[PDB]
């Protein structure tokens, strides 16, 4: 199945 894509909120 699919792999969840995430992002750090502070950049």
């Amino acid at each position, epitope marked *: 199945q699919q792999q969840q*894509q*995430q992002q750090q*909120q502070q950049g």
Partner: antibody
Amino acid sequence: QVQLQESGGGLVQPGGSLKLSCAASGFTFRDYYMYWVRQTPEKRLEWVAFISNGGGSTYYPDTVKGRFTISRDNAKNTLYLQMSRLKSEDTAMYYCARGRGYVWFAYWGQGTTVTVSS
Amino acid sequence: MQLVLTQSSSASFSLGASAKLTCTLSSQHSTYTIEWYQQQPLKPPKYVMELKKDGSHSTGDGIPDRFSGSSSGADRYLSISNIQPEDEAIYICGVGDTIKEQFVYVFGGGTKVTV
């Protein structure tokens, strides 16, 4: 302490338009992604818009894509949501939010209500 | 299949009693990490916790230790022990998928925990 304060809501008509604002404080605004999330009268939550820290990227769900526009003025520490071609279904409490780590909605504002009626 | 979150039905509980809420991910996304949110009357939603497929989780600020999370397959759980009066709220789970082509965020229908 992180603070988000929305404003701009009110009574409007279908086909109309209005622009919401969210004043941010308690953190370095330009370093964070920002969002708009709404809650319908039936209490259902729906993510409405995303904007990257410098305003470079934006994303919207199909329900509002060609009608809503999220923007920000980092110098003013303010987030905006331009709502055009309003639909009755846009009636909801609108919240601005900020994330933490990998969580999108860690901090929420108090909300502003947009009421669309014929 | 689209990313969907299905939540357990709203129920009433007795003070002190225990409760177990369920949020089930669509099969294609059974490994996803979700978020649990709590919304008390006339208040905005509050970040309760980030729950991973392995059961590991991290709660938000002001979240009572009696609040715990676990998982099982596509199921993500929120267990409230020692149900207090301030626990009466709507609990909504959410899941994000920052796909570059198009970001997606889905919220569950919510579970009313009447106490």
